[PDB]
Design an enzyme around this catalytic site. Structure first.
Site, PDB file in Angstrom:
ATOM      1  N   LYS A  67      -3.637   4.666   0.483  1.00 42.14           N
ATOM      2  CA  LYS A  67      -3.283   5.829   1.291  1.00 42.14           C
ATOM      3  C   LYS A  67      -3.895   7.157   0.823  1.00 42.14           C
ATOM      4  CE  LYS A  67       0.978   4.589   0.895  1.00 42.14           C
ATOM      5  NZ  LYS A  67       2.475   4.485   0.922  1.00 42.14           N
ATOM      6  N   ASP A  79       9.085   1.066  -0.603  1.00 43.02           N
ATOM      7  CA  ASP A  79       9.798   1.595   0.549  1.00 43.02           C
ATOM      8  C   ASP A  79      10.283   0.521   1.549  1.00 43.02           C
ATOM      9  OD1 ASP A  79       7.106   1.262   1.183  1.00 43.02           O
ATOM     10  OD2 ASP A  79       6.890   3.165   2.263  1.00 43.02           O
TER      11      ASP A  79
END
Ligand SMILES: OC[C@H]1O[C@H](O)[C@H](O)[C@@H](O)[C@@H]1O
Length: 453
Positions: free
Chosen positions: A163, A199
């Site tokens: 990311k 997450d």
């Protein structure tokens, strides 16, 4: 009619984004093969899809109660949250008490691991200051949303950044250690880091209290990933043959060994080639909010070159990398032909849009967004169908907990996604729920079970 002629030509350029049902089944089956390979000792090192054990187990397990600090790194911002965990007449509820979001400057991001975690530590300090509780020493839970090799719930090695993270000297190291060190170096507060979770995992957990059938966690935000409760005996990397363990697929790396080559478009290859991690996270790059706006930008640019948009003239802004943000995509309507928002977006980008330019920009947005939903649906379907086979059930009823900037804020995405997943999952009854503060709460719940020693 002229505007019709332009739109027909646009549609022929955008047809490239279509995915037939058989294209999706092909992707789904390929995804299942990589999952199989990631779970087995002999092929695990070469699997594109890593299927990492999280050490989050289905076993009903003793939990402390009280206040927990939750940190969340890996989305848009870094978030710090006070969470209260308590026992309820049923199970263990969790409630967000306080919260602050922090942006991370580009430098703190692409310097050293030490700078990054120092920055993290400053934000924690700031939040403690705000609530005058620098004195307290809390159990801290760390939602850290990157590929980690866990040895246990509170010790994990970063495999690689994703990311757009690039902090040096972090890969191959214990992430919990980096955080403890940074907090140590600072001094003005103390914390017991007791857990670290992805997450996807935190989100799954956060949804358990409300629905014991939640055994899949899914994130469609900046990045895209999923975890699920695998049969312990299929987890060849962890001794044990009873009950289930949460597996972190890290499915974003699907395609990293050629699996998607026939589906990649020039826009995809361009985005990948210009990214921080070329050749990696190819599946995620088709879906993730980090990449979605940029894909749209490249499509618009192609349409300009064909003289179908903006009279073949693109502002310097539109020619700027990253200038078309993903949120713009979500500010684009669908079922209504509203042009207002698009007109504003495009004007701010230094364009003089016609009514027709707006309609074309909307189609470009739909095309990219819709292919994201479709691609994402093959991954989740692959997972869920595999669980059905693994549990040998004729009909499987399963709840999927979902979080992330894209699933929550892109209405068209959610709808296209649900419908596609369902067509691909015969004989599964799938319930979707949006977690609320899933990361923060999920992490505190894991911290609560970890503190009980
Ligand atoms: O944030 C969603 C996902 O983004 C990236 O794929 C990260 O590698 C993964 O760990 C995370 O879960």
């Amino acid at each position: 009619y002229f505007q019709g002629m332009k739109k027909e030509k646009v549609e022929q350029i955008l047809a490239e984004f279509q995915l037939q049902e058989e294209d999706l089944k092909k992707v789904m089956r390929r995804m299942q093969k990589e999952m199989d390979r990631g779970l087995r000792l002999e092929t695990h090192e070469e699997a594109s899809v890593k299927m990492l054990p999280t050490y989050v187990r289905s076993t009903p397990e003793g939990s402390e109660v009280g206040d927990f600090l939750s940190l969340d790194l890996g989305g848009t911002n870094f978030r710090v949250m006070l969470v209260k965990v308590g026992e309820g007449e049923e199970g263990q509820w969790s409630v967000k008490t306080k919260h602050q979001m922090y942006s991370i400057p580009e430098d703190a991001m692409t310097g050293t691991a030490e700078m990054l975690f120092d920055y993290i530590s400053e934000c924690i300090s700031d939040f403690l200051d705000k609530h005058q509780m620098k004195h307290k020493k809390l159990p801290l839970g760390f939602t850290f949303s990157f590929p980690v090799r866990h040895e246990d719930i509170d010790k994990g090695i970063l495999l690689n950044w994703t990311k757009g993270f690039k902090a040096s000297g972090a890969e191959g190291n214990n992430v919990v250690g980096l955080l403890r060190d940074a907090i140590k170096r600072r001094g003005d507060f103390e914390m017991d880091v007791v857990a670290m979770v992805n997450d996807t995992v935190a989100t799954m957990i956060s949804c358990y209290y409300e629905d014991h059938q939640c055994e899949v966690g899914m994130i469609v935000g900046t990045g895209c990933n999923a975890c699920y409760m695998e049969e312990m005996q299929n987890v060849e990397l962890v001794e044990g043959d009873e009950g289930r363990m949460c597996v972190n697929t890290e499915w974003g790396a699907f395609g990293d060994s050629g699996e998607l080559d026939e589906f990649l478009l020039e826009y995809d290859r361009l985005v990948d080639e210009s990214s921080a991690n070329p050749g990696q996270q190819l599946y995620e790059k088709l879906i993730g909010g980090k990449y979605m706006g940029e894909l749209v930008r490249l499509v618009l640019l192609r349409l300009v070159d064909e003289n179908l948009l903006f009279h073949g003239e693109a502002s310097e802004q539109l020619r700027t990398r990253g200038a078309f943000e993903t949120r713009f995509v979500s500010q684009v309507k669908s079922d209504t032909g509203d042009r207002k928002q698009i007109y504003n977006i495009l004007s701010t980008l230094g364009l003089r849009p016609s009514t027709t330019d707006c309609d074309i920009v909307r189609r470009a947005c739909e095309s990219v967004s819709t292919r994201a939903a479709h691609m994402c649906s093959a991954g989740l379907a692959g997972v869920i169908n595999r669980m059905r086979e693994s549990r040998s059930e004729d009909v499987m009823r399963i709840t999927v907990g979902v979080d992330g900037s894209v699933y929550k804020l892109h209405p068209s995405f959610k709808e296209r996604f649900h419908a596609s997943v369902r067509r691909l999952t015969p004989s599964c009854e799938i319930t979707f729920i949006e977690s609320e503060e899933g990361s923060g709460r999920g992490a505190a719940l894991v911290s609560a079970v970890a503190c009980k020693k």
